[PDB]
Design a protein around this ligand. Structure first.
Ligand SMILES: CC(C)N1CCN(c2ncccn2)CC1
Ligand SMILES: [Zn+2]
Length: 140
């Protein structure tokens, strides 16, 4: 579990979005595994605006933050998980590291701020849904 709290937006994995998220929906994309809802209180996070390929992510199934190198966001085939069938996921970055389903929502960050959230795992990789292209998160 986990979210990004930027301005008056909550960014969550689409598959973990709640009824309240859907009732306060700003934007969602199944192919990216993202959903954004509106918040009453302003949030503490800054979104990275960069093309970094190194950062640090939180792994809840280890209670640990790990430094990783990661691929640039791409359209990638993802094998079946507990929460999605085998399918193509867009705007996905991969690193070598540990990720189980409940790790979804952990933040990946670089020197510029939040890069994305854990969205995939298995086979010794962790996949992150990028948010650095979503420039509208920084205003309004
Ligand atoms: C949500 C649904 C599409 N899933 C969940 C069950 N399943 C699976 N596959 C691999 C590992 C664990 N569970 C495939 C079908
Ligand atoms: Zn960066």
């Amino acid at each position: 579990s986990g979210a990004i709290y930027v301005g008056n937006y909550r960014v969550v994995n689409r598959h973990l979005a709640t009824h309240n998220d859907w009732a306060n929906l700003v934007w969602e994309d199944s192919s990216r595994d993202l959903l954004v809802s509106s918040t009453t209180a302003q949030g503490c996070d800054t979104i990275a605006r960069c093309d970094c390929q190194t950062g640090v992510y939180y792994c809840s199934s280890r209670r640990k933050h790990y430094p990783v190198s990661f691929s640039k966001p791409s359209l990638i085939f993802v094998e079946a998980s507990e929460y999605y069938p085998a399918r193509y996921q867009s705007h996905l970055m991969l690193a070598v590291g540990h990720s189980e389903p409940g790790d979804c929502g952990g933040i990946l960050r670089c020197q510029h701020g939040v890069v994305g959230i854990v969205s995939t795992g298995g086979n010794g990789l962790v996949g992150f849904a990028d948010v650095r292209d979503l420039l509208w998160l920084d205003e309004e």
